[PDB]
C-alpha cells in the first residue's frame, strides 16, 4: 500500500518508454536502477581522526543510515598513511530508501548548487554506471547551516542494469537528471 | 667490452665443455657467419677484438651481429697467495661455446670481402672455426 513516487514513475511508464525506444527482445532486458553509493573520502584524517565524526554525522543526516568506517588497506608514507585507520565512510542505499533519496537529490539538493550549470553526460563508466563527485555538503536541507565546521563533499555513484553508455544515459535522462548537451 | 647489467650470483661453477651445441646452430640474421668447431670459453675482450677487426675490414656498409654474450663470470685469486681462504673475485666474463655454435654474423654485398672480414675475425678467436652460409 506504500509506494515511493520515483518507483511509481519508473514502473508505470519508463518500462514502456524504454521498450519502444530500444525494441528489446523481452521485458527482463529493460535497464533499471540497482543501488546508489555515497561516500566521503576523508584521507586528511591521518593528521587528526576527529574529521571522521563530522563525516559520519553528515552522511547519517543525509541518508538516514549510519555509515561504516573504511580503513586503509595499504601503508603509504607519501600521504603518511599506515595500515588500518579511519579514512572514509560509505553508505549503500537500496530499495525505497535509495528511491526517495535520489528523488530528493534530483529535486532539492541539486537546484541548491551554487551556479548549477549541469552534470556532464560523459561522466558514465562505459558499462552503464554513473558517478559524480560533489564539492560541498550544504545543499541538503537536512543539515543545519550552522552545523558546518568545514566543507566536506561526497561521491555519488549510481549503479544501473544498463549494458553501456547509451541505455545508462537514456535511463538517467528519463529519470530527470539535469544533463548538458555538447 | 660486453658486461651484463647484473647477475643473480657473482661466483659460479665453471661452465661445462661437454657435448655439441643444440641451439643457435644456423645463420639467422645475416648472410654469412662464423661457426665454432671446438669448445672454449670466449671472453669479452676477444669478442671486442673480433668485432673491431670485422668492422675495420668492412669499412662503411654492412651490419654485424654478435649472437654470443659473455654472461658467465670467472674469478681469480690475488697473486702470490696460498690455497684456501675463500673463492677469488670475479674478473673475467666469458660465454660457453660448443661446436656447432654460430658466433658472429655478417651481411655485406660482396662475397670476397665478406669472407675476408670473417677470416680476420676468426684469427682473433681461440677456436678452430669455419664460415657458413644460409644455403644447405
Amino acid at each position: 500500500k506504500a509506494l515511493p513516487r520515483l518507483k511509481q514513475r519508473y514502473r508505470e511508464e519508463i518500462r514502456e518508454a524504454l521498450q519502444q525506444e530500444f525494441n528489446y527482445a523481452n521485458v527482463m532486458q529493460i535497464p533499471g536502477v540497482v543501488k546508489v553509493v555515497v561516500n566521503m573520502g576523508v584521507g586528511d584524517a591521518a593528521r587528526d581522526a576527529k574529521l571522521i565524526n563530522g563525516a559520519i554525522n553528515d552522511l547519517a543526516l543525509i541518508t538516514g543510515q549510519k555509515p561504516e568506517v573504511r580503513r586503509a588497506r595499504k601503508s603509504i608514507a607519501q600521504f603518511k598513511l599506515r595500515e588500518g585507520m579511519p579514512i572514509g565512510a560509505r553508505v549503500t542505499l537500496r530499495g525505497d530508501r535509495m528511491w526517495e533519496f535520489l528523488d530528493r537529490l534530483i529535486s532539492i539538493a541539486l537546484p541548491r548548487i551554487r551556479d548549477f550549470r549541469g552534470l556532464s553526460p560523459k561522466q558514465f563508466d562505459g558499462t552503464g554506471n554513473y558517478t559524480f563527485g560533489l564539492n560541498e555538503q550544504s545543499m541538503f536541507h537536512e543539515i543545519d547551516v550552522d552545523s558546518i565546521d568545514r566543507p566536506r563533499g561526497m561521491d555519488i555513484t549510481v549503479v544501473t542494469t544498463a549494458t553501456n553508455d547509451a541505455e545508462g544515459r537514456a535511463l538517467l535522462r528519463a529519470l530527470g537528471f539535469p544533463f548538458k548537451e555538447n | 667490452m660486453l658486461i651484463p647489467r647484473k647477475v643473480k650470483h657473482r661466483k659460479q661453477h665453471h661452465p661445462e665443455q661437454r657435448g655439441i651445441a643444440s641451439g643457435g646452430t644456423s645463420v639467422s640474421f645475416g648472410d654469412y657467419g662464423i661457426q665454432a668447431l671446438e669448445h672454449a670459453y670466449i671472453t669479452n675482450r676477444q669478442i671486442e677484438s673480433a668485432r673491431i677487426a670485422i668492422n675495420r675490414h668492412i669499412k662503411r656498409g654492412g651490419k654485424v651481429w654478435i649472437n654470443i654474450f659473455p654472461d658467465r663470470p670467472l674469478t681469480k685469486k690475488p697473486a702470490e697467495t696460498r690455497m684456501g681462504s675463500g673463492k677469488g673475485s670475479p674478473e673475467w666474463w666469458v660465454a660457453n661455446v660448443k661446436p656447432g655454435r654460430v658466433l658472429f654474423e655478417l651481411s655485406y654485398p660482396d662475397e670476397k670481402t665478406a669472407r675476408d672480414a670473417l677470416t680476420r675475425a676468426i684469427h682473433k678467436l681461440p677456436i678452430k672455426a669455419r664460415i657458413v652460409t644460409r644455403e644447405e
Partner: protein
Amino acid sequence: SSSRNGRDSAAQRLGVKRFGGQVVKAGEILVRQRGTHFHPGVNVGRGGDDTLFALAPGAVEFGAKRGRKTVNIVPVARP
C-alpha cells in the same frame, strides 16, 4: 682473506620411508616431509610437522586425486 660463509644445519633425513606395496602396521611413519608434497589418503593421517602416518594395517599405495599426490593404505586380506 676470509669468507663470510661456512656454516650449515644438519640434514633432517626426510623422504619416503615405505614405498608402494610395502606392508605397514598402524601408526608407522610413511613419509617425512616439510610441506604437503604428499597429502593423506584413506587410512593415512597427517602429523603436526606434516609427516604422514598409517592409521590402519595394510599395504601402502600411492596415487593421485584431482592433481594431488596422495598416500593410501590398502586393507590386505586375511591369510
